[PDB]
Design a binder for this molecule. Structure first.
Ligand SMILES: *[C@@H]1O[C@H](CO)[C@@H](O)[C@H](O)[C@H]1NC(C)=O
Ligand SMILES: *[C@@H]1O[C@H](CO)[C@@H](O)[C@H](O)[C@H]1NC(C)=O
Ligand SMILES: *[C@@H]1O[C@H](CO)[C@@H](O)[C@H](O)[C@H]1NC(C)=O
Ligand SMILES: *[C@@H]1O[C@H](CO)[C@@H](O)[C@H](O)[C@H]1NC(C)=O
Ligand SMILES: [Ca+2]
Ligand SMILES: [Ca+2]
Ligand SMILES: [Ca+2]
Length: 519
């Protein structure tokens, strides 16, 4: 990038019969001198310029001027363009490619023209001069060139298939995948795209989750007559919509909450709709189609109606057939009505984190004081408990069941373990703390008349428990639980009780649980 100032260079011509010049330009001015090559001894010259917004390549190899203009485009709208011209004897070509903008999707063509018959070599003396974006008074421009200034910014210049200041006159100077993760406590909105066309819908976004019941997307009119939703149902992707004449809904044959990225695509044309789910790695694709009932053809979403993702806020009204359960999982490449959206650019979303981190369903982590409720499990004679944790908060409950109860918890550095129906063990760390942010594995085994605990293979403590009746509880928790000791903060994983691995795929409840990884 270079604004304002003229940049002169001394070219190196390899083939006198061939020329190739590449320039990147960006301006709002209709007339400019983009490239120029000439010398003091010869009239010969090369030049790339614009007239009324059109790029023209002109030259004179000693027998008269040759000019070829690119008609397909006009480049004075401030987008970046790649202008490439070349010469073969008296034959010149011009080609323009827009790097961005509404023209960037065009297919760059190539027009040719020729200079008068005769000479064919680009003559130049020793002190040749190649100017970029303007002209220096050290050389007299060819009459054919009418404007010698340049208002804008120039890009990488290539001359004779090689990159390119001998003299710098003037004061020179330079010039949305949106991957997100929801953890069951957020939502996000997107205003309706102006490109929204009522009788044709187009929805795309990639998702990756372990959730079986969630809301992925929902939109509706103020009256609820017309709406559309995309949710997870038992792991399957389910689509529902009503255009005002009657609702319909399809559920995929396969479930897609395997932790892998999936590509979702909906295409509705009036009452008909094609849903497509693709496992991005294996490239396998599923296809399910459905049709709304009646005569209405449009999803008449209005100017002020919002489109939500991952969850919803509290709404006065809400379509009765949709599962609004907050979504836990990642999202990205959201596109609606041909319009891309980046939730992170949104100003009113809640409980969303940039990126994606989903490792397994046996790991959980708490950012803020939170908890995860698991199905009750009682400790009987012969029972074991194995888990791993890593917090930096001396005081925090790690495990807990519900008179009777059991618990593994850090206490001002100490790691208590309680059993009752009340005996308990308390290990004081030595040579290293527990809430030291690094891995730590606990082991607890209640046998006859005794119970044991052992952290990261050290002194397996012991304690009496002359009872045989199994200590049963009503609820089981990881991280903490609803009600006086501080909250737990770090992550717990690979929880095993009575030989059964305890996953967090779908907890009975939770609050501020970043299930799936150790943040
Ligand atoms: C100039 O070159 C192009 C391609 O190399 C060719 O299509 C065109 O006919 C040439 N001009 C003429 C007529 O010599
Ligand atoms: C659905 O897909 C079929 C091809 O599988 C196509 O012919 C039809 O036009 C599509 N209709 C839509 C986009 O609803
Ligand atoms: C969209 O569908 C409606 C029926 O719901 C129809 O009356 C209307 O003409 C369609 N829009 C157009 C003009 O394509
Ligand atoms: C727990 O640790 C976090 C940092 O991991 C800290 O911000 C917070 O204040 C701590 N909470 C308590 C109860 O000390
Ligand atoms: Ca010549
Ligand atoms: Ca309607
Ligand atoms: Ca309608």
């Amino acid at each position: 990038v270079s604004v304002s100032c003229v940049r002169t260079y001394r070219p190196e011509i390899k083939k006198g019969s061939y020329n190739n010049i590449v320039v990147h330009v960006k301006t709002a001015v209709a007339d400019n001198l983009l490239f120029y090559l000439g010398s003091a001894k010869f009239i010969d010259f090369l030049a790339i310029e614009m007239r009324k917004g059109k790029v023209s390549f002109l030259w004179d190899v000693g027998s008269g001027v040759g000019r070829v203009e690119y008609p397909d485009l006009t480049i004075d709208d401030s987008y970046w363009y790649r202008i490439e011209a070349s010469r073969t004897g008296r034959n010149g070509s011009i080609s323009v490619r827009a790097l961005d903008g509404p023209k960037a999707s065009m297919v760059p063509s190539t027009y040719h023209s020729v200079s008068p018959p005769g000479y064919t070599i680009l003559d130049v003396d020793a002190n040749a001069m190649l100017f970029v974006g303007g002209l220096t008074g050290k050389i007299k421009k060819a009459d054919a060139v009418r404007v010698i200034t340049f208002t804008g910014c120039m890009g990488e210049t290539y001359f004779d298939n090689k990159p390119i200041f001998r003299e710098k006159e003037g004061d020179c100077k330079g010039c949305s995948e949106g991957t997100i993760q929801f953890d069951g406590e957020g939502y996000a909105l997107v205003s309706r795209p102006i490109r929204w066309y009522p009788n044709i819908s187009t929805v795309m976004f990639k998702f990756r989750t372990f959730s079986s019941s969630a809301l992925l997307m929902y939109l509706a009119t103020r009256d609820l007559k017309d709406f559309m939703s995309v949710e997870l149902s038992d792991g399957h992707v389910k689509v529902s919509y009503d255009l005002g004449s009657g609702m319909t809904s399809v559920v995929s044959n396969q479930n897609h909450n395997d932790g892998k990225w999936k590509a979702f695509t909906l295409s509705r044309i009036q009452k008909q709709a094609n849903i497509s789910i693709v496992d991005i790695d294996s490239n396998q694709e599923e296809n399910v189609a459905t049709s709304s009932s009646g005569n209405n053809f449009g999803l008449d979403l209005k100017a002020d109606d919002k489109i939500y993702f991952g969850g919803l806020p509290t709404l006065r009204n809400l379509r009765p057939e949709v599962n609004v359960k907050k979504y836990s999982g990642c999202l990205k490449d959201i596109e609606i009505s041909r319009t891309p959206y980046n939730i992170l650019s949104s100003p009113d979303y809640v409980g969303v984190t940039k990126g994606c981190s989903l490792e397994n369903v046996y790991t959980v982590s708490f950012p803020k004081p939170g908890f995860v409720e698991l199905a009750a499990v009682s400790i009987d004679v012969g029972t074991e408990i194995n888990l791993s944790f890593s917090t930096r908060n001396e005081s925090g409950i790690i495990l807990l069941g519900s008179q009777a109860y059991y618990a593994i918890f850090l206490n001002k550095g100490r790691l208590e373990v309680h059993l009752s129906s009340m005996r308990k063990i308390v290990i004081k760390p030595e040579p290293n703390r527990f809430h030291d942010g690094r891995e730590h594995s606990v082991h607890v085994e209640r046998t006859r008349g005794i119970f044991t605990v052992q952290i990261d293979e050290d002194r397996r403590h012991m304690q009496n428990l002359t009872e045989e009746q199994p200590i049963e509880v009503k609820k089981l928790f990881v991280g903490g639980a609803p009600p006086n000791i501080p909250a737990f903060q770090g992550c717990v994983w690979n929880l095993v009780i009575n030989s059964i691995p305890m996953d967090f795929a779908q907890p009975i409840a939770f609050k501020n649980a970043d299930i799936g990884r150790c943040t």
